[PDB]
C-alpha cells in the first residue's frame, strides 16, 4: 500500500541531510524532489517511501541485453511504483513507462570553466583543443547518438571515439572534470542543472549559448499503473498554483552562493 518512490541523488533535487544518520526514512533527505514528492503524495492521497535508485542511473536500454537500467528499469521490472526525479521525457522511455505532463522545462546546454573560448555547440564542433562529453546512460547521450543535425552529428562522431573517454558516470563527475580541466573540457548537461551549478561556489563555471533542444522532466509510473491519472492531474494543479516555481526559487536562487 505504501508507494515505493525511486529517485536519484542529484543536487538540488535529492540530497542527504547533514544529520541523516540520526534520522529515519524519508526524513533523511531534502531537496526539490523531496518537497515535490511530499506534495504529490498529499494530493493523490498515498503514503510513500523514498528510495535511491540502486545503480545510480537515470535509465537506458542496453543495446545487447535489451535490459533497462536506472530508474526506468526499476519501474519496468516492478522494483518501484513511481519515479519522482529530474527524469527526462523521451520517446524510447514513454514507450515502456508513463510520464505525467512536465513539471520542469529544460534543454541540453554547454557548461564551461569561466574563460573558456567557447560560445556555442558549433564552436565545440569546429575545434579539437577543448574536449567535451556527456553523462553515460542518459537522454543527452541518446540525443547525440541519434541526431541528424550536421553540428550535432559531428560532435557525436568525435565524442564516441575520443580517448580517453569523454563520458562520465554521474553529473557530479562531469562538473568536477570541467572545474579541474583548466578550460580543456566542456560538459554537455541539461540547462537547469547548468544554471544551478553556476550559482554554487567556487562560482567558476557558466552556461554558454542557447539550449540545443527543448523538453521536460516528468513523473514516471509503470505502464498502466493506477497512480498515473491522479499524479498527472496533481502536477498540473501544482504547476498552476505556482508550487513548482516556488520550489525552483527555493532550491536554486534563495540558496545561491554566487
Ligand X SMILES: Cn1nnc(-c2onc(O)c2C[C@H](N)C(=O)O)n1
Q: In what order do the strands lie in the sheet with 108-113?
A: 131-133, 185-190, 108-113, 205-208
Q: What is the DSSP string of 84-107?
A: -SSPBP-HHHHTTEEEPSPSEEE-
- Does position 171 interact with ligand X (CB under 6 A)? The reply is yes
**Residue with Cβ nearer a copy of itself (182 or 237):** 237
**Residue with Cβ nearer ligand X (74 or 190):** 190
| Helix (H/G/I), strand (E/B), else coil: 83 | strand
Provide the annotated binding site for L-glutamate.
86, 88, 93, 139-140, 190
Q: Hey, which residues between 10 and 69 contact a copy of itself (CB under 8 A)?
A: none
- Does position 98 interact with ligand X (CB under 6 A)? The reply is no
Q: Hey, which residues between 103 and 132 contact a copy of itself (CB under 8 A)?
A: 105
**Residue with Cβ nearer ligand X (10 or 123):** 10
- Does position 249 interact with a copy of itself (CB under 8 A)? The reply is no
In the list 28, 79, 101, 184, the residue contacting a copy of itself (rule: CB under 8 A) is: 101
Stretch that binds ligand X, among 30-38, 43-51, 82-90, 121-129 (CB under 6 A): 82-90
Ramachandran angles phi, psi of 16, nearest 5°: -80, 135
Which three cell numbers mark 10?
542529484
Strands, DSSP E only, in 84-209?
Answer: 97-99, 104-106, 108-113, 131-133, 185-190, 205-208
- Does position 257 interact with a copy of itself (CB under 8 A)? The reply is no
Smallest gap from residue 145 Cβ to a copy of itself (A): 11
Taking CB within 5 to 8 Å according to partner kind, which of a copy of itself, Zn ion, ligand X, none is near residue 193? ligand X
Residues 6+ apart with CB under 8 A from 229: none
**Residue with Cβ nearer ligand X (104 or 238):** 104
Do residues 29 and 105 touch, judged by C-beta distance below 8 A?
Answer: no
Pairwise CA distance, residues 131 & 62, whole Å: 26
Distances (CA, A) of 159 to 8, 138, 156, 194: 25, 14, 5, 20
Taking CB within 5 to 8 Å according to partner kind, which of ligand X, a copy of itself, Zn ion, none is near residue 171? ligand X
Binding to a copy of itself by CB under 8 A, coded x per residue (else -) over 146-185, reads xxxx------------------------------------
Amino acid at each position: 500500500k505504501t508507494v515505493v518512490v525511486t529517485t536519484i541523488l542529484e543536487s538540488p533535487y535529492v540530497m542527504m541531510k547533514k544529520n541523516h544518520e540520526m534520522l529515519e526514512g524519508n526524513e533523511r533527505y531534502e531537496g526539490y524532489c523531496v518537497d515535490l514528492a511530499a506534495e504529490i503524495a498529499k494530493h493523490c492521497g498515498f503514503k510513500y517511501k523514498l528510495t535511491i535508485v540502486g545503480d545510480g542511473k537515470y535509465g537506458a536500454r542496453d543495446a545487447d541485453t535489451k535490459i533497462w537500467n536506472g530508474m526506468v528499469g526499476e519501474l519496468v521490472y516492478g522494483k518501484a511504483d513511481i519515479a519522482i526525479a529530474p527524469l527526462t521525457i523521451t520517446l524510447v522511455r514513454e514507450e515502456v513507462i508513463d510520464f505525467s505532463k512536465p513539471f520542469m522545462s529544460l534543454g541540453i546546454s554547454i557548461m564551461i570553466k569561466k574563460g573558456t573560448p567557447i560560445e556555442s555547440a558549433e564552436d565545440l564542433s569546429k575545434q579539437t583543443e577543448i574536449a567535451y562529453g556527456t553523462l553515460d546512460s542518459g537522454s543527452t547521450k541518446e540525443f547525440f547518438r541519434r541526431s541528424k543535425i550536421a553540428v550535432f552529428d559531428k560532435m557525436w562522431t568525435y565524442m564516441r571515439s575520443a580517448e580517453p573517454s569523454v563520458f562520465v558516470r554521474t553529473t557530479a563527475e562531469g562538473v568536477a572534470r570541467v572545474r579541474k580541466s583548466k578550460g580543456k573540457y566542456a560538459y554537455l548537461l541539461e540547462s537547469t542543472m547548468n544554471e544551478y551549478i553556476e550559482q554554487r561556489k567556487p562560482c567558476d563555471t557558466m552556461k554558454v549559448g542557447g539550449n540545443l533542444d527543448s523538453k521536460g522532466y516528468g513523473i514516471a509510473t509503470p505502464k498502466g499503473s493506477s497512480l498515473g491519472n491522479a499524479v498527472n492531474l496533481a502536477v498540473l494543479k501544482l504547476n498552476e498554483q505556482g508550487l513548482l516555481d516556488k520550489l525552483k526559487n527555493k532550491w536554486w536562487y534563495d540558496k545561491g552562493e554566487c
